[PDB]
Amino acid sequence: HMTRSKVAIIGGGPAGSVAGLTLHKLGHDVTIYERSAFPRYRVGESLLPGTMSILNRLGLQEKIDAQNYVKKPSATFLWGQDQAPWTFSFAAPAPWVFDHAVQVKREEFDKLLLDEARSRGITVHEETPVTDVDLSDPDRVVLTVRRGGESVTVESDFVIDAGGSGGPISRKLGVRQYDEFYRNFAVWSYFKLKDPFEGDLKGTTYSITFEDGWVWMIPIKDDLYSVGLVVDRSKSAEVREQGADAFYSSTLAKCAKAMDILGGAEQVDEVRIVQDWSYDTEVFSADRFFLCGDAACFTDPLFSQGVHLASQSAVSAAAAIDRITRHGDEKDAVHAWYNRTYREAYEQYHQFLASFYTFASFTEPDSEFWRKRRITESDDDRLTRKKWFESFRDRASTMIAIGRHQRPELSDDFSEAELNPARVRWISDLTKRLNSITRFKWTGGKAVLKQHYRVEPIGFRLEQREVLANGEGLDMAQYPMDDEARQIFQDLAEEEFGYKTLVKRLGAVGRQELSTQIVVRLMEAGLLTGYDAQGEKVFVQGRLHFGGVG
Numbered sequence: 423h424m425t426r427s428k429v430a431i432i433g434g435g436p437a438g439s440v441a442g443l444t445l446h447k448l449g450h451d452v453t454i455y456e457r458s459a460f461p462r463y464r465v466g467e468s469l470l471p472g473t474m475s476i477l478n479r480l481g482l483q484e485k486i487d488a489q490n491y492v493k494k495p496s497a498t499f500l501w502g503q504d505q506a507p508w509t510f511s512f513a514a515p516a517p518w519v520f521d522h523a524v525q526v527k528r529e530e531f532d533k534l535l536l537d538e539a540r541s542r543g544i545t546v547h548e549e550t551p552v553t554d555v556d557l558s559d560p561d562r563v564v565l566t567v568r569r570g571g572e573s574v575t576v577e578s579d580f581v582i583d584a585g586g587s588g589g590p591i592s593r594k595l596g597v598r599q600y601d602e603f604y605r606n607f608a609v610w611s612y613f614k615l616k617d618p619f620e621g622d623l624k625g626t627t628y629s630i631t632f633e634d635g636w637v638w639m640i641p642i643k644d645d646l647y648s649v650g651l652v653v654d655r656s657k658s659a660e661v662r663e664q665g666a667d668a669f670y671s672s673t674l675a676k677c678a679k680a681m682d683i684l685g686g687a688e689q690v691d692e693v694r695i696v697q698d699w700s701y702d703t704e705v706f707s708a709d710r711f712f713l714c715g716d717a718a719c720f721t722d723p724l725f726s727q728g729v730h731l732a733s734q735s736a737v738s739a740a741a742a743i744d745r746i747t748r749h750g751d752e753k754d755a756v757h758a759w760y761n762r763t764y765r766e767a768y769e770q771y772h773q774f775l776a777s778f779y780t781f782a783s784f785t786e787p788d789s790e791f792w793r794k795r796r797i798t799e800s801d802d803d804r805l806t807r808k809k810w811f812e813s814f815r816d817r818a819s820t821m822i823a824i825g826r827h828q829r830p831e832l833s834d835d836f837s838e839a840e841l842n843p844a845r846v847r848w849i850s851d852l853t854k855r856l857n858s859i860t861r862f863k864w865t866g867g868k869a870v871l872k873q874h875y876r877v878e879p880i881g882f883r884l885e886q887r888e889v890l891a892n893g894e895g896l897d898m899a900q901y902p903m904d905d906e907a908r909q910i911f912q913d914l915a916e917e918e919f920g921y922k923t924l925v926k927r928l929g930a931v932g933r934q935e936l937s938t939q940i941v942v943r944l945m946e947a948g949l950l951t952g953y954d955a956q957g958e959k960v961f962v963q964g965r966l967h968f969g970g971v972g
């Protein structure tokens with residue numbers, strides 16, 4: 423209980439800094455090894471509310487307010503050809519809950535976090551690459567580090583690899599699993615251009631489909647836009663052959679709505695490229711190591727999840743190391759929790775992504791980009807799927823409908839309030855479906871409490887919580903339940919009462935304000951199935967934020 427660990431951290435990007443700040447607040451002894459000198463240039467500029475929340479709870483609010491980062495209200499999508507625009511609002515009602523995020527210059531943002539780490543007495547070595555990581559001694563971790571021109575050797579109780587896509591551990595272990603099809607390749611530059619919108623659109627992140635993929639437009643200053651192409655890795659050869667500059671301009675010129683908003687603006691930087699393929703890992707952590715951020719997995723940046731998942735996993739890996747340090751018998755359970763949680767985030771962002779790419783594929787040409795990414799299924803499943811012609815994948819269908827602008831084209835006429843009717847209409851539809859449920863069935867014959875972990879948001883400790891499950895381990899981990907609320911569900915499994923009874927029984931035990939969320943989550947978890955008065959199944963899903971929002 424008074425025991426704390428010595429922890430080496432490879433990499434001082436967002437995963438590294440957040441991991442070190444969190445481990446320090448949890449009372450551990452942190453060293454961060456970063457191979458570069460800061461500031462150093464880095465792409466990946468558009469952030470999420472969930473990450474601001476984390477930084478706020480770690481005490482960075484004043485330093486961040488000081489920076490005057492461009493504020494981001496939402497993300498806007500021009501998705502498919504001749505489609506109305508849609509926007510994903512960051513609108514949301516605790517002190518750390520954020521309704522917006524920001525856009526940053528990563529060289530400055532990353533250096534701000536790292537300098538904060540320094541100021542708290544965390545040891546930081548810049549220009550000190552970690553050259554080898556040895557885990558074969560089960561009692562310790564030993565790193566080899568290049569200090570000056572000398573190899574120096576250092577031991578620690580734990581190691582976090584936050585070294586980004588080039589982190590040494592996943593490579594060393596050979597546990598990286600590249601996605602078979604999501605092999606994105608990016609080519610980008612900067613323009614001098616002032617946000618052309620004054621209304622609710624100002625500061626929004628634009629993602630815009632064309633023949634060979636999509637274009638991003640991020641305002642990182644008053645008059646500065648990051649403008650990137652995401653294309654298939656099959657375009658590597660063209661860039662190799664014809665040069666990135668020529669590839670960049672002739673490709674970007676193919677995206678009319680993008681040239682539309684650009685309009686003669688001046689290109690104000692060189693163009694860079696990189697391979698950004700999706701991949702996860704067989705192992706997110708085991709024994710004395712954790713992988714965090716791109717070192718663990720990489721998600722197609724369409725929804726700007728990257729820095730958020732680096733931050734979230736960094737906080738989780740910190741809490742995990744703390745828990746194991748104070749309760750060493752829980753080692754296996756804690757690693758199983760870290761692996762499950764990261765895997766589930768990765769896999770469900772991927773499933774969701776597949777939906778979005780498929781929707782654009784109906785109006786974009788049959789290029790290798792769209793063909794690799796759109797859902798694979800029978801000629802007949804696909805023609806049926808132009809059920810789309812007339813509006814995870816209903817989850818995405820939902821988001822798009824709610825966010826649909828009420829005119830055919832993108833304009834400063836847009837206000838987020840014009841989205842309120844479709845929102846409300848979705849809520850009324852959800853309310854209508856739940857109310858029609860006169861009979862519920864439980865999956866299995868037993869309702870049980872199962873052990874689960876949760877990071878406490880204020881102090882960051884990993885706490886134990888009992889969640890609802892069946893005998894066969896299926897669970898709904900998002901809410902803490904007791905023997906008392908479990909009884910509710912055992913009675914349900916036996917008597918199969920409907921929605922009205924379930925709401926009442928929940929209210930009766932203090933859970934009146936969560937009850938709608940509780941039953942929706944149980945439905946999505948496949949633990950509850952609902953039936954209407956005519957005996958037909960009733961399908962409910964109430965998701966529709968992508969992670970790090972709302």
Ligand SMILES: *Cc1cc2c(cc1C)nc1c(=O)[nH]c(=O)nc-1n2C[C@H](O)[C@H](O)[C@H](O)COP(=O)(O)OP(=O)(O)OC[C@H]1O[C@@H](n2cnc3c(N)ncnc32)[C@H](O)[C@@H]1O
Pocket residue numbers: 432433434435436437438455456457458464465466467468469550551552553584585586587588589590608650696698714715716717723726727728729730732
């Ligand atoms: C590729 C890409 C990614 C991207 C993006 C657009 C593109 C083309 N747009 C994004 C966006 O709009 N919003 C967002 O949140 N993310 C976006 N991304 C992805 C995102 O940039 C990454 O997920 C994020 O950078 C990951 O953070 P993480 O902390 O995991 O990794 P990092 O930023 O690469 O930092 C790693 C540091 O480690 C150092 N390093 C590497 N190896 C060593 C060794 N061996 N020893 C010591 N240090 C090491 C690197 O120097 C780096 O600083």
